[PDB]
Design a protein around this ligand. Sequence first.
Ligand SMILES: CO[C@@H]1O[C@H](CO)[C@H](O)[C@H](O[C@H](C)C(=O)O)[C@H]1O
Length: 147
Amino acid sequence: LQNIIYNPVIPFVGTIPDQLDPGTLIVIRGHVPSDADRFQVDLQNGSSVKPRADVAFHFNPRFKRAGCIVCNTLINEKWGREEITYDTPFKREKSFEIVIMVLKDKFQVAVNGKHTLLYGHRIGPEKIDTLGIYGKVNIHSIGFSFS
Ligand SMILES: CO[C@@H]1O[C@H](CO)[C@H](O)[C@H](O[C@H](C)C(=O)O)[C@H]1O
């Protein structure tokens, strides 16, 4: 793991230090606080707030009832079609490890050592330069492994 960031302040917005070529890993460790409604990891084209930066990959756990993960893409401030994963491995009051692997045609996401979902590229991964983490979550560390 390279360019490791420890105990960032949330919301975190930071520049990904190298290109997201296939085989690249983003490793995020943290825990979900007890009153958590949702949080999100956003892979962004830039960090502009107005107009809001495009989000190539929105990864968004929600914690109401059984919960879900919602994945989507924001282009010119418009959300596309949602892809919802109902079998969530996140729970309130539990620690997690998210590993996002970038492949040629999609992201693959594993949580706590177990494959969770695939998400097909809607924007070219070469446009992504910014990692954003927002909402009710505590991040212990963020690390990269570049191919
Ligand atoms: C129809 O709810 C929207 O769903 C979106 C996901 O497609 C996204 O999760 C939005 O969350 C917040 C408001 C955001 O990051 O803009 C939410 O309001």
